[PDB]
Design a protein around this nucleic acid. Structure first.
Ligand SMILES: Nc1ncnc2c1ncn2[C@@H]1O[C@H](COP(=O)(O)OP(=O)(O)O)[C@@H](O)[C@H]1O
Ligand SMILES: Nc1ncnc2c1ncn2[C@@H]1O[C@H](COP(=O)(O)OP(=O)(O)O)[C@@H](O)[C@H]1O
Ligand code: ALF
Ligand code: ALF
Ligand SMILES: [Mg+2]
Ligand SMILES: [Mg+2]
Ligand SMILES: [Zn+2]
Ligand SMILES: [Zn+2]
Ligand SMILES: [Zn+2]
Lengths: 366, 360, 343, 334, 368
DNA sequence: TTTTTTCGATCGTATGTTGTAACTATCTC
DNA sequence: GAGATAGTTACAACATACGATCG
């Protein structure tokens, strides 16, 4: 079982797999990583019983099938110690593996690979492939609305829905809603799943500049994404999610159109004297006029006036400036359309150019 | 498969067994438009506190309107029943006790409801919150915003601060009687198409001790061990129902101060295998019956006719004070039975103490 | 290693200096006085630069080693002070001190200040190596018996006329706290330049700041001084001492007394003391305590102790101190109506 | 963990329900120590987590079986007190409940085992209440206890109770004779002290417990003729103090039984000591001493960190005091 | 639609405050004379109205008509204070604002002059929940605050505050309201609300209030809900007055007279009526206690139970005190024994049988 | 010539270390 | 003269140690 490894190739995958691994083992073998050889590739896998990450590296020299477990810390230290450019020779000799770095021979303890909690058989309920750009855009536009720590555990993640030839990401936290839709060009069964925060953030982290498409397959209880030479597998909350379309206001009478940059600057300027803890502002909308008022616990007040395209009845609405600013920043467009019904109803925000993504904010009642 | 206590949860006020006063008060309040912002349901174990709170939430957040008879078919009712309704936030108060959770929850009371008209915070097992959490709650509970309602459910109201009790409308549930539990069990079994006998249902209702969840758990035990049949023999075997005159024989031997026969009977019962607490309860009942007979000769009920004569003999020999002393000794033995090296050892110690109590 | 006392350091310093000095003890006053005297003598001998560090694994030894190896731009004969941890040196600290010992040279003057070292702590390679060229100072707080002598010596040094009654008052009020005694003497001298410290003058300018330990309380109980025991218990309560330590300290002596009294009827007392390995100085007190009370007492005391422990643990009560006072009175020759004992 | 033969019947019942998809989501097994309920729970868990069960027996070849044998199954959760400590904290319960909100990695059932529900604190039980009430799908809870009457009433009222009983004394004696090699009287006494549990008697024989019992018997035989009970302290002061207090209580109860002329006695190997106790002590003093011993044992087993030596010494001193004439004996109260 | 009575009927003037005459008089005299301190602390039970008095004082200080003991209630400042919108009334929730960072921020932002009013009133509620660091930070500011700054504090447990904080403030302790004041306030509120009521219902509600007036208002709301728009004696008795019936007194008299048949008949009648057994024991114990108090002091019995006064007095003249003590102890022990009894009715019957068996005058006949 | 105290759960203050995001400076196009 | 890449500073989140209260 002779394996020749180059430090340059081995460096980055080792750090990637060791990333999720933490100091606290919680199990004798959890800290250890599984190294296996199949055909002409070597797979290094690491998991913490919640998420699994496996990286594959091509092999050219002749070899035979095998699989073992190696501690992560010792292997990382050995790799770091060796000078850059060194070639590592790894052999299997009994219960302890042999590492031959030049004239230095090291014996590393090996635990049986049959006891490693690694998934053996995978069944895909729905599988597809997409460019990294689309997935990155959807995640970036829908991530900021996820709840962090809430009693409603089903709100602590992102809802991925495949419908016909459309992929939809939904995020909610009880006060704001973000929905994004994008065509995929393939017909898929109607299916909805929930991915927790950890899976989404890990997927975003591992995702890089669009070079090759990534393939995502979702089964009964798990989701596995393969990109380049990495595969990341996670499990799902499975707690059911509220229907977003119900949350969206029905028949919004009042429509307003404005410039994204002007509104962003106005909100940023008004937020200077806004309440630090609450960050509350008041909007008075009248015919082709929008007045933004901010108050401070120190009795300070700020007022701004802007010109917009509006023709409905005068309205006064309270809002949280931080959420509006986040929505405007994520939207990243030129013209913004706001749909509202009354002073005690949620307000929807979209782009005049296209309706690919929508946001909803619930006003604060004083 | 879902257990009976988890499948037959009431879905409307018509399905609630007992608790007439609370339901009537809630219906009157909803009809007259006098909704309060704080409700505290206090009661014993398994009397429908959570069920009543959920039904009240459904009524408050029904699409048709604020009604005491929720439709149960509109989207709001269906989502509340499923448990994925955004505006209904159900706190645990046992897994989330720290002040940070309460403080961040109280900072989200300003935003309007996402879909419904009221934001309903259902706090269950509220008696497991720290003092800081209660103090933080106080002022918000006193004068919350219009679109927010607080529902509290506890099984130990005396552990809460007095101010918290004073800031809420208290509804005290009552323990269900034997007849109501028996009727509910019969109805459930008829719906489920399961054979049953009147004696088995009566025994289960008596053993439920006023809790319906306990009755359903015992019924499930009988079904599992009764080969899908609630028979009298199976229930008696599970509950260790004394049938012969072991209790009367032991009482007579104890009164006669014949320790040898008492110990022989104890050994025989242990060899057979009997629930000691049931035996003590039967002995207490017999002593009470003897005392009643001493009070009036007609107290003896016909049910215990087969031993009537013998019973009367005791009423003609044992002074009432001695009967009271024996009753209290057996009661104390029952109380301390769990906290003994062995149940048989506790029974033997109690009976030896009773034997040594002979004042004559 | 030259062992000395704080009252014999000025003569040694005048005779000459030494490579290193070690100050171990408990009383802050004597330790700081010795430190000040040593630093003043060193400065008189040309030691200008002074640096202080607190020994701690968090603290970095690289800076100290660099300072020892480095030489000042326009100074010589540097002084280094090391404050040992209260718990005591650790193996890593021992290795660091061993490394430092080699770096020591003529110009560098090392002064170590810290708590008294135990038998295991004293046994160290660096300490043994430095013993050949080290001066150690024993700083132990004087006992109540030795306190009046120290107070009289202090008064004589400052040119103050202190009466016996005033000496006793000062010893009682500031027992175990020499710093308070010194500050009180300074304040009294400032108040009256004449220096005639009569009893009323001291009584009108003294406050209660005594410091005690549970061992003192147990010794007072054995002696039988009810007033002293109550004063010690009150002081311990005021300073915020957990009663658990008091209970466990009293338990050992109470059980030993019970066992000795039970066995005293068949064996000589000296043989029992030898078997139980009691301190020689404590034998007289133990015998007096045994002869002072009979088996009737030391049995109700066990009941009181058990009830107090149960109240503390099961009930989490707050009346522990009252029960402790009652037990203290019971151990002394008092009636103790026994309704409280709940026999 | 040993599979005793007498556990075969009960298993055949419980598994049957789980074969029909009618098993309760929370099972509470009542059994005396040494009855092997842990083995039954482990067998049920192995059957539940097996992916290709062969009737009532786990295949032993599927991935689930391999992981369970290796003790690394992701979907298997166990709640036990930490090393050294003798209680189960709230943090472990909270962690398990939070983890349960996610789907099983292997796409199967999730098993949560509580080693001893009696060790749960009030906060832990209250936290576990709601999770036990409405657990997620394909979630099974297994609990074990000796006396279900001590558990919180709300916790009790939402679990299916299953009671285990020991076999007849003849069967247990035969099994012990097959396993251990001692006199018939010794085996019978060990079984009776164990409340009929065959496993506990084997544990007593395997170790120094029997030697400690013999030493205690010798010390008591020396003490009874005289008034020197304090000498028993050396025989009692030890980690296994509750067991020795239980042995003393059984001896006193046997003495009382002999005083009343009974026939069966718990101790059938030391008739002379029982006779001496009966002769030299009156029934009232025996009852008072038995009550004191039981109360002290309960206090030692209940209170945390209580001083063993002080309590035992006080108990011995009070026992000596009672034997004196003109002493008011205690009376039970409620 | 209707707002809760407690929130609606909040005293908006010193004339609307029920009781607490001493504190109101002191505050009025201070405002009239002009001797205004910079630190007021209010203490008492729950529902006495510390927060209401603090709000009234804040209205009095910041009024466009000047510093007056009788605020107009019509000027915009009074309206804003009533609506909780005044800019110069900083209300602090000490329960949530416990960390010292909030206290440091408040003390850092205490120098600026008020916007509109003549004072910047800091009303800190539940001050007893602050950590020691917050108290220490607030010490010096309380010692020498700016002229235009006033501090008002309210708490339920002033015993846990630092001694220095107590020394640095003017203390006002409110006492619990008596039955008559609560009854009068409830009658006035119901008359204003146009809701039918009966005198005994008001008496029962006042007795159940136990000082706290907010408890009285909550119980009144419960009674209104139960009675379907009316406050009837039966409606109140259904939820609160399940006890206090002549059956308890009849049982006590029968037990005193050793009439076993009468006691058994009364027990059967109570069982038919569906009477809670623990409540029955509580009522019997209460009646025995009040008879004992009558024996001690003739003025123990007030008008509350005047309907039975005469009868009670008779039981005081005949029954020796020792018999009353024996009955009380027996009933108390039976109450201790009730939870472990096989049945509640059986437990009560056994308790009464034990009481009859040891009757001091005529014990039950002994066997022969 | 030397002797070391209950335990669990919850709340608050202050310091030190690591990682990510936002803003600024320099080199090459 | 402007844009892209690399480096520095500031803010937020996590980890460790010490002190205090109530059950
Ligand atoms: N009064 C009641 N009416 C109907 N069902 C009840 C009642 N009390 C308990 N239950 C039963 O108990 C289960 C719900 O438990 P529940 O009693 O609501 O919890 P809690 O202990 O909070 O009251 C349901 O399965 C239900 O059938
Ligand atoms: N003295 C009083 N007079 C009239 N109503 C009062 C009085 N005290 C309290 N209340 C009523 O009780 C309710 C609660 O009072 P609250 O402000 O909470 O007092 P505290 O601060 O003492 O709890 C108020 O809404 C008010 O209507
Ligand atoms: F759900 Al419960 F008491 F069993 F509130
Ligand atoms: F608001 Al309070 F006692 F002052 F409940
Ligand atoms: Mg419930
Ligand atoms: Mg208030
Ligand atoms: Zn509906
Ligand atoms: Zn298998
Ligand atoms: Zn005004």
């Amino acid at each position: 079982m002779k394996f020749t490894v180059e430090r340059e190739h081995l460096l980055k995958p080792l750090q990637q797999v060791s990333g999720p691994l933490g100091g606290r083992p919680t199990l004798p073998i959890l800290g250890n990583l599984l190294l296996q050889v199949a055909d002409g590739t070597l797979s290094l896998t690491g998991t913490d019983l919640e998420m699994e990450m496996v990286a594959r590296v091509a092999l050219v020299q002749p070899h035979e099938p095998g699989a073992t477990t190696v501690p992560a810390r010792k292997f990382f230290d050995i790799c770091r110690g060796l000078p850059e450019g060194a070639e590592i020779a790894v052999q299997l000799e009994g219960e302890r593996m042999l590492v031959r770095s030049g004239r230095s021979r090291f014996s590393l303890s090996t635990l049986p690979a049959a006891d490693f909690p690694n998934l053996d058989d995978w069944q895909s309920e729905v599988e597809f492939t997409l460019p990294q750009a689309t997935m990155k855009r959807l995640i970036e536009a829908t991530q900021f609305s996820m709840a962090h720590q809430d009693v409603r555990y089903y709100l602590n993640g992102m809802l991925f829905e495949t419908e016909g030839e459309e992929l939809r990401t939904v995020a909610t936290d009880g006060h704001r809603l973000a929905v994004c839709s994008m065509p995929i060009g393939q017909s898929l069964p109607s299916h909805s799943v929930i991915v927790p925060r950890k899976g989404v953030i890990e997927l975003m982290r591992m995702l890089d500049g669009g070079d090759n498409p990534l393939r995502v397959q979702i089964g009964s209880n798990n989701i596995r994404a393969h990109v380049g030479d990495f595969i990341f597998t996670s499990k799902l909350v499975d707690g059911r999610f509220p229907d977003y379309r119900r949350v969206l206001p029905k028949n919004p009478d009042k429509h307003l159109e404005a410039g994204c940059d002007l509104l962003k600057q106005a909100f940023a300027r008004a937020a200077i004297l806004s309440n630090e803890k609450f960050r509350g502002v008041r909007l008075y909308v009248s015919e082709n006029q929008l007045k933004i008022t901010a108050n401070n616990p120190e009795q300070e007040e700020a007022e701004e006036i802007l010109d917009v395209t509006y023709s409905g009845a005068e309205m006064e609405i309270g809002f949280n400036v931080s959420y509006v600013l986040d929505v405007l920043n994520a939207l990243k467009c030129e013209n913004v359309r706001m749909m509202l019904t009354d002073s005690v109803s949620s307000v929807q925000i979209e782009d005049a150019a296209s309706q690919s993504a929508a946001y909803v904010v619930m006003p604060m009642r004083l | 498969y879902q257990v009976l206590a988890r499948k037959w949860r009431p879905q409307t006020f018509a399905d609630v067994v007992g608790q007439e006063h609370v339901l009537t008060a809630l219906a009157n309040g909803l009809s007259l438009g006098r909704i309060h912002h704080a409700y505290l349901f206090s009661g014993t174990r398994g009397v429908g506190k959570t069920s009543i709170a959920r039904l009240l939430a459904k009524g408050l957040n029904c699409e048709t309107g604020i009604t005491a008879t929720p439709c149960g078919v509109c989207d709001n009712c269906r989502e509340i029943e499923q448990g994925r309704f955004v505006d209904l936030i159900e706190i645990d108060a046992a897994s989330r006790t720290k002040v940070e959770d309460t403080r961040d929850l109280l900072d989200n009371v300003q935003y309007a409801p996402a879909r419904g008209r009221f934001k309903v915070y259902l706090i269950d097992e509220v008696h497991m919150l720290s003092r800081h959490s209660f103090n933080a709650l106080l002022k918000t509970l006193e004068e919350p915003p219009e679109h927010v309602k607080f529902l509290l459910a506890t099984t130990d109201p005396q552990k809460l601060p007095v101010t918290i009790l004073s800031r809420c409308l208290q509804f005290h549930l009552k323990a269900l009687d034997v007849e109501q539990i028996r009727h509910q069990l019969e109805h459930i079994l008829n719906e489920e198409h399961i054979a049953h006998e009147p004696r088995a249902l009566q025994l289960l209702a008596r053993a439920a001790e006023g809790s319906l969840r306990d009755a359903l758990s015992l019924t499930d035990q009988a079904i599992a061990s009764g080969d899908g049949q609630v028979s009298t023999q199976a229930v008696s075997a599970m509950l260790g129902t004394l049938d012969d005159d072991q209790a009367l024989s032991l009482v007579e031997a104890m009164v006669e101060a014949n320790g040898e026969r008492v110990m022989a009977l104890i050994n025989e019962a242990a060899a057979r295998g009997i629930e000691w607490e049931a035996l003590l309860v039967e002995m207490l009942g017999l002593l009470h019956r003897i005392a009643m007979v001493q009070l009036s000769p007609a107290a003896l009920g016909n049910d215990m006719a087969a031993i009537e004569l013998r019973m009367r003999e005791l009423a003609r020999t044992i002074p009432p004070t001695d009967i009271q002393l024996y009753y209290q000794t057996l009661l104390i033995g029952r109380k301390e039975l769990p906290y003994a090296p062995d149940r048989r050892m506790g029974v033997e110690m109690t009976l030896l103490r009773a034997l040594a109590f002979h004042p004559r | 290693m030259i062992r000395l006392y704080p009252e014999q350091l000025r003569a040694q310093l005048n005779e000459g200096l030494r490579a290193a000095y070690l100050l171990l003890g408990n009383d802050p006053l004597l330790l700081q006085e010795s430190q000040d005297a040593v630093r003043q003598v060193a400065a008189a001998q040309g030691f200008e630069e002074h640096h202080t560090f607190s020994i701690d694994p968090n603290t970095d030894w690289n800076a100290i080693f660099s300072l020892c190896q480095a030489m000042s731009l326009f100074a010589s004969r540097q002084t280094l002070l090391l404050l040992l941890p209260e718990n005591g040196p650790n193996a890593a600290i021992n290795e660091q001190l061993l490394t430092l010992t080699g770096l020591l040279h003529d110009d560098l003057l090392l002064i170590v200040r810290g708590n008294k070292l135990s038998k295991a702590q004293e046994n160290a390679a660096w300490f043994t190596a430095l013993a050949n060229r080290s001066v150690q100072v024993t700083c132990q707080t004087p006992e109540q018996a030795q306190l009046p002598r120290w107070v009289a010596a202090r008064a004589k040094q400052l040119n103050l006329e202190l009466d016996d009654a005033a000496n006793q008052v000062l010893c009682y009020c500031y027992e175990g706290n020499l710093l308070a005694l010194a500050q009180a003497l300074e304040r009294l001298s400032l108040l009256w330049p004449d220096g005639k410290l009569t009893l009323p003058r001291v009584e009108q300018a003294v406050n209660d700041a005594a410091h005690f330990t549970p061992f003192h309380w147990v010794d007072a109980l054995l002696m039988g001084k009810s007033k002293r025991a109550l004063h010690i218990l009150q002081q311990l309560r005021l300073e915020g001492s957990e009663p658990v330590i008091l209970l466990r300290t009293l338990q050992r002596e109470l059980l030993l007394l019970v066992n000795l009294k039970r066995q005293s009827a068949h064996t000589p007392l000296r043989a029992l003391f030898d078997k139980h390995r009691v301190w020689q100085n404590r034998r007289g007190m133990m015998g007096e305590a045994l002869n002072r009370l009979s088996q009737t007492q030391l049995r109700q005391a066990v009941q009181l102790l058990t009830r107090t422990e149960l109240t503390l643990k099961q009930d989490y009560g707050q009346s522990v101190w009252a029960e402790l006072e009652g037990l203290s009175l019971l151990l002394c020759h008092k009636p103790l109506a026994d309704v409280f004992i709940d026999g | 963990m040993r599979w005793y033969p007498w556990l075969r019947p009960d298993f055949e019942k419980l598994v049957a329900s789980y074969q029909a998809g009618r098993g309760h989501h929370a099972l509470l097994i009542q059994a005396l120590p040494g009855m092997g309920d842990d083995a039954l729970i482990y067998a049920l868990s192995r059957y539940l987590l097996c992916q290709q069960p062969q009737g009532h027996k786990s295949c032993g070849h599927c991935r689930g079986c391999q992981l369970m044998q290796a003790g690394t199954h992701p979907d298997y959760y166990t709640l036990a007190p930490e090393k050294g400590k003798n209680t189960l904290g709230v943090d472990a319960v909270r962690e398990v409940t939070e983890k349960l909100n996610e789907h099983a990695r292997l796409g199967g059932a999730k098993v949560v085992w509580v080693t001893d529900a009696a060790l749960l604190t009030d906060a832990a039980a209250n936290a576990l209440l709601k999770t036990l009430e409405e657990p997620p799908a394909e979630t099974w809870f297994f609990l074990a206890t000796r006396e279900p009457e001590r558990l919180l009433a709300t916790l009790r009222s939402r679990c299916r109770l299953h009671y285990l009983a020991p076999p007849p004394e003849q069967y247990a004696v035969t099994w012990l004779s097959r396993e251990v090699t001692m006199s018939q009287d010794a085996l019978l006494a060990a079984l009776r002290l164990s409340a009929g549990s065959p496993g506990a008697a084997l544990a007593l024989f395997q170790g120094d417990n029997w030697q400690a019992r013999e030493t205690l018997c010798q010390a008591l035989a020396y003490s009874v003729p005289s008034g020197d009970w304090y000498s028993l302290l050396a025989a009692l002061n030890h980690e296994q103090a509750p067991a020795r207090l239980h042995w003393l209580a059984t001896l006193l109860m046997d003495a009382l039984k002999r005083h009343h002329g009974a026939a069966q006695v718990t101790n059938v190997d030391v008739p002379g000591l029982v006779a001496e106790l009966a002769n030299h002590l009156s029934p009232s003093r025996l009852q008072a001493i038995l009550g004191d011993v039981c109360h002290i044992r309960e206090q030692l087993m209940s209170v945390t960190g209580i001083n063993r030596e002080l309590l035992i010494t006080d108990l011995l001193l009070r026992i000596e005091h009672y034997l004196q004439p003109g002493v008011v004996l205690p009376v039970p109260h409620l």
